[PDB]
Amino acid sequence: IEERYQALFSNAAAVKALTQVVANSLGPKGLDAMLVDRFGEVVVTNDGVTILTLMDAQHPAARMVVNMARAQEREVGDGTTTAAVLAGALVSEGVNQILKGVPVSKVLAGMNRALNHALFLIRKNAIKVGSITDDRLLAAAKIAGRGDERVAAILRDAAAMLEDKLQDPGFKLADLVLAKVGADTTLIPGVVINKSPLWEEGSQKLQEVRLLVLDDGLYPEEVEEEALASEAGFEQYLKNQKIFQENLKKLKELGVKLILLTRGISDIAEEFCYENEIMVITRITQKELKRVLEFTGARAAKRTSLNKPVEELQKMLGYARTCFYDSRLDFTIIEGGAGKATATVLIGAATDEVVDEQERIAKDAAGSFAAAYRSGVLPGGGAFFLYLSREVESLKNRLPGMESYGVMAFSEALKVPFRVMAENAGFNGLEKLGDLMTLQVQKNNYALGLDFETGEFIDMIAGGVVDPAEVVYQAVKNASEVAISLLKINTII
Amino acid sequence: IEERYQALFSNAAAVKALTQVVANSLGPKGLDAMLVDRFGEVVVTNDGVTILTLMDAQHPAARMVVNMARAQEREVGDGTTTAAVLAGALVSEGVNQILKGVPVSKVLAGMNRALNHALFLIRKNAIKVGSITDDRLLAAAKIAGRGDERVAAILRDAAAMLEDKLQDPGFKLADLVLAKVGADTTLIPGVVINKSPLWEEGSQKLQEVRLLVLDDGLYPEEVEEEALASEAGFEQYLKNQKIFQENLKKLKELGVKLILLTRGISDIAEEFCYENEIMVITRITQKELKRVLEFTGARAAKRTSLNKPVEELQKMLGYARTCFYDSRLDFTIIEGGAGKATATVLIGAATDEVVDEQERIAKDAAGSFAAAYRSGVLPGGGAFFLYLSREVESLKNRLPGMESYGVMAFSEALKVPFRVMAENAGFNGLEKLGDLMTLQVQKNNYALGLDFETGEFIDMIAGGVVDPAEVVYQAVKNASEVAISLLKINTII
Amino acid sequence: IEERYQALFSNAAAVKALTQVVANSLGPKGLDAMLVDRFGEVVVTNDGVTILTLMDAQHPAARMVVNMARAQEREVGDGTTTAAVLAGALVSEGVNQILKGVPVSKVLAGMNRALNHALFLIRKNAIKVGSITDDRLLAAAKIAGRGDERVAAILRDAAAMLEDKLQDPGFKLADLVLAKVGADTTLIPGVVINKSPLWEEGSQKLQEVRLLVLDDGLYPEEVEEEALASEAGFEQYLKNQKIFQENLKKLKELGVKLILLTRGISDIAEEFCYENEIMVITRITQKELKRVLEFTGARAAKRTSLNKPVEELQKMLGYARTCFYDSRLDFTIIEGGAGKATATVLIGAATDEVVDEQERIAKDAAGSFAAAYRSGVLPGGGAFFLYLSREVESLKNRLPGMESYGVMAFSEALKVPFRVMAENAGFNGLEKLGDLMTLQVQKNNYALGLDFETGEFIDMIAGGVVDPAEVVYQAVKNASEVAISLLKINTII
Ligand SMILES: Nc1ncnc2c1ncn2[C@@H]1O[C@H](COP(=O)(O)OP(=O)(O)NP(=O)(O)O)[C@@H](O)[C@H]1O
Ligand SMILES: Nc1ncnc2c1ncn2[C@@H]1O[C@H](COP(=O)(O)OP(=O)(O)NP(=O)(O)O)[C@@H](O)[C@H]1O
Ligand SMILES: Nc1ncnc2c1ncn2[C@@H]1O[C@H](COP(=O)(O)OP(=O)(O)NP(=O)(O)O)[C@@H](O)[C@H]1O
Ligand SMILES: [Mg+2]
Ligand SMILES: [Mg+2]
Ligand SMILES: [Mg+2]
């Protein structure tokens, strides 16, 4: 039952230890981390929420910041490490002010006012985009993709085929990513079924594919096992074994050349498909189901649906221009669908470790693209944080009293992300920080930032280094929620 | 939770320990290794990915390298030991550069640049093949086959019968290999069922074989057990017990003399076959099924398929010129199929251990054959790597900065496989290295290498010592990818 | 029984771990280290040989480098950390060359030639001093004193009172240092007895002190306890109790006002001294004895010496102008002695920890002063090492063959001390290293070094930053002896 100041200590320390760890991954010069499970498994990543999640972090405070990261990821998908470092800074500063005797009440008030002002400036200064072709969107994607231009171009190009889906606040663009070992990273103008067909004789290409999709399995209508002791029961078994074979005949009459199922397939049916040139894939994902349904313009059927007359069934079929089973990667690719258009961002690499990290990078980039398209952009490099820092310090006195301390803490904490990245890039973090602030004021350009390889100060938006607006809004908001939440803590059980 | 430089050590150390072990297997003068199971089993091999797999690899880094090896094996099937050694070299070199104070970031940048240049040069210089007969294909097969010209001739001859199949990026030539103790290494122009027939009276030869093959078992159409309490149910048990017998008569009328099944056989049928001299094999592999299907031109049937008219059944039969059951080796050989032609590369030896290793060698040779046919060849003996080192060191200058160090590390690392193979062959590795590099430049022949037997420098391509191109590309790509990914690691949990 | 390469590893690693630790203490921006004994004791220091000595370092290699440091300290007293870092560099480089396949023989040869050339250049380029007043001597003292100018001035000033003693290769100037808690650091133109007198009535000052010094105790000539059973024995006891009291009377007649003893004092004598105004100090060090003997011009006596006639005794007395017992610090100070002149460099601080570290600094400075006075000076900052580095790399080919590698290693290792200090000063170590080397060649001034606070390149000798020549000679020589000694190692038991 730790209490008093030795609660606030026990907390703050617990957070520092956490943030220190991911601090090394923040930025373009950030380094990776290697994690192993309690009993032998291994991941390597630069992703923040990943690192923070996989260490089983035992202190409650640490677990809370981890949850904050999770939240940040859920909201936008990037800016996790930023949120962590920022949170840590906020907390440490808050503690510092509190130890010097500043009332918690006041620290929290100042921090809140600061927060609201900050978010205000962030929403206000967001520079919005009109296109999807705008180089600022692709730039956002590149920065989030950690410098991969190929991937950024791929995602822009896919989003282009969508856009409408971006209008729904529930469409995660990264859902389009699909990772496959031994693949080559590329854009597929169709959907992928990541499974081998029921019968394979090597790689295979299909053209003018009329397909039938089932959220069922291709079995006859069943008769409960008990009921088979009852003549009529059995006669029903026979009857709908007959109507079943008739239905398969319907399938051939309609010219079906592909069948996808979410369940299994009868032996009789399997034979029918083999003899009549029909390809089958079983056990498809629900996700896969939805996407192929949309793309091919097919309607989802159950076994009973095959009892429709043939004229009514042709209406449930879908169409794809081509369809290709890759014997080397063991999946199937449907392209040229008669329904909505869509894409699959295929991410390839040699080994599991690498394709995993590349998928994470991909999804980061996708989310940040979408986030940019939805919310506009801002100058990256952490500069806009510095703008926010002086603007927040502006508020130091607009309410006089001890809330000032609180405000200062917030301002000072906003200085930290940048400093870290500069330190990560081998520079004198503090020096570059100060210099850049002075310069920002003197040329009045709050978009001036640091080029981390060359070491020269540049114009960030000019340099193609932009962050999505919502990523910053969300990062600051979440980091703030957790830090303020922790600072109000006085006792532990 | 080890961090900082003392992560980079524990990683690097863990890797050297691994690579050292397989280094002695690299080359034509490389030596073998012996491995034992947790509870009594034994392997002997010169193969890299195998040794690396069977080892107790506990460290995360080592496990990552094993995984890389696995990837290299998946991709091309040869060149694993090379990839391991190269990877290790890259890592140690990188560590050294980082220790003299080069920023990790810069090292990795330089290495990436080097990598890309290397791959470019590798692809550019690939020497293409235009025939399945080219003496360079057989050369590749010989070298990968560790000097065995018998096997190489067999694979050339076998690959020849296909050609149509190699065109599929999913066709593993090595899938043709089959190992049998007490056999003699030979080319079989058919497919083998590695099983004894259901009824054997000693070795037996069949000619003019009309055969029927089933992805089922030869049983009557079943009736669920419960339903038998229901008159109609039983009456149909009877009815399609009669229909089964008449179907067998159909088999006799068609003159079927061989039956292959992936499931079992009813006793009634087994008697039918005994009395009408029809040979039967049960429980065949999926491989065996697909192969015999393609080769005999038969169509796969299920029990229900025997209900067609006799005239219709005659269409799914297949035909083989001859068919021979070997009582000594206890398998069956189908030759002269009316379908596509194919081959079985039979690999024989006295003991389990040896035929296992000879099989590994065979598959390696097949894979390098196919890969040569697909991607061309390059000068082996480790020479082309020296050319690439000489070429990569070039960039040190063409881009200024500290990336140079990184590039140097890459350059210096490509030097290692050769030096290892030379030391393994009992030469002064460093001397031969220097001499050979100097010479390579002076005669401008980027293909001069060391004959590890004679000790004289020869032209490797003229000397018939060639590596498949894709094997080199994949090896460099993979070793690089893993080393770079490990060097970016800064912390371990 | 570790053997082969895994001896050379086990060694090299063991050394790295050691050197890393003291590397942080090297330089003007070096930081301190805290050590605790197996059972609760504590030291804080920047001294190298101290840090290295106090960790109980378990690996044989580590223990050897520690011994090397000890040696360096014995020889000159400064340059310990330099020697350690240099040794480490030499070893790591040597290992690197050896792993690439360079014959140990050759590495060692190259390193030796390099060593001899280096020492040659060091002896050749030593810039000698003529004075003792030369600002280059005081500069040497300041640099060694870690920037304390007060102390440097003190030591120069004392050495001035000696100089003759410096002519003997056996006089350690640092022997003049005396550390006292609660004292004030100052030069005393006399000698100090660090003990309280036999009888104290508070602080006390004596003038015109005629003193008697005894390497004995003031007791009568003894009679063995057995002998006291023998009349004549006892009569001898009486007799030389009588002649003893007479001798004390001689002591008063001669006007003795102070007596120093290395042993004890009789009760009768103690009374005699109390009643006749005579101060006594008992149990003085041998060191203290020698110094006060020299300074006061007294001759050492034993009890029997008091049997001389008075006229002959006056000849054994010594004289001091003044003599002062400080009741606050509890020691005694003799000044204005009629013998040789001498000094006591009194080092004061508040606490044990601090006065200890300050004594270490003092002795460092004293030794480096003396070393400068005896052997001349060189440009510090590690620059002269860089001169030596290019000069050593000069030798790379003057013998062609693989010794070249060895030579290079030596050269490259000489680059390391500087780099470390630059890294310690928060700079980019590698960058500053390279820049400075280029500049050194371009302005041809091999005395150009780095100002570690300002960050600008300056002329070192001009900047007052000089090392004693012998400190460098010794550092390089010793570091080399141990590194070469370790590299010849192939097996461990
Ligand atoms: N080339 C660049 N120049 C300057 N800043 C950059 C550059 N690339 C990325 N950044 C900045 O790096 C930060 C993002 O680093 P990153 O490693 O993604 O942390 P994070 O995105 O906050 N957490 P996460 O991406 O989920 O791992 C942002 O502040 C970017 O502005
Ligand atoms: N006769 C030869 N002369 C010179 N080099 C040869 C000769 N035979 C093979 N090599 C080289 O030896 C290497 C093959 O060694 P090997 O032991 O197969 O390693 P690996 O093939 O890379 N790994 P793995 O085959 O999976 O066990 C290649 O670099 C060949 O170029
Ligand atoms: N102001 C300075 N500017 C430049 N170099 C300096 C300065 N002060 C000291 N040095 C260098 O610092 C080194 C000595 O550092 P130091 O910490 O004494 O290590 P060390 O003397 O080799 N071992 P030790 O002195 O026994 O602890 C020498 O190379 C000096 O040239
Ligand atoms: Mg990011
Ligand atoms: Mg091979
Ligand atoms: Mg010193």
Author numbering:
A (entry chain B), B (entry chain A), C (entry chain B): 10 to 502
Q: What are the paper's exact sentences on this?
A:
The crystal structure of Ch-CPN in complex with AMPPNP, an ATP analog, revealed its closed conformation. Eight subunits (from S1 to S8) assemble into a hemisphere-like complex with ~ 73 Å in height and ~ 160 Å in diameter. Two octameric hemispheres are stacked in a back-to-back manner to form a hexadecameric sphere with apical domains gathering around the two poles and equatorial domains at the equator. The stacking is mediated only by equatorial domains in such a way that each equatorial domain in one hemisphere has only one contacting partner - the S1 equatorial domain in one hemisphere directly interacts only with the S1′ equatorial domain in the opposite hemisphere. First, an inter-subunit β-sheet is constructed by the stem loop in the S1 equatorial domain and the N-/C-terminal strands in the S2 equatorial domain. AMPPNP binds to the interface between the equatorial and intermediate domains. The β- and γ-phosphates are hydrogen bonded to Asp87, Thr89, and Thr91 in a conserved P-loop motif characterized by the sequence GDGTTT29. A magnesium ion whose source seems to be the mother liquor is coordinated by the three phosphates and Asp87, which contributes to neutralization of the negative charge of phosphates. Asn55 and Asp56 in the so-called stem loop, and Arg155 and Asp373 in the intermediate domain interact with the α- and γ-phosphates of AMPPNP in C-subunit. In the closed form of Ch-CPN, eight α10 helices from each subunit are located side-by-side with no overlap at the center of the ring to close the chamber.
Here we describe the prototype crystal structures of the bacterial Group III CPN from Carboxydothermus hydrogenoformans (Ch-CPN), an extremely thermophilic, carbon monoxide utilizing bacterium isolated from a hot spring in Eastern Russia. The subunits of Ch-CPN assume the modular structure consisting of an equatorial domain, an intermediate domain, and an apical domain. Like Group II CPNs, Ch-CPN is a hexadecamer consisting of a doublet of octameric rings, its subunits interact between the rings in a direct rather than staggered subunit to subunit fashion, and achieve cavity closure independent of co-chaperones. The closed state with a non-hydrolyzable ATP analog and the open state with ADP represent the conformational states of Ch-CPN before and after ATP hydrolysis, respectively.
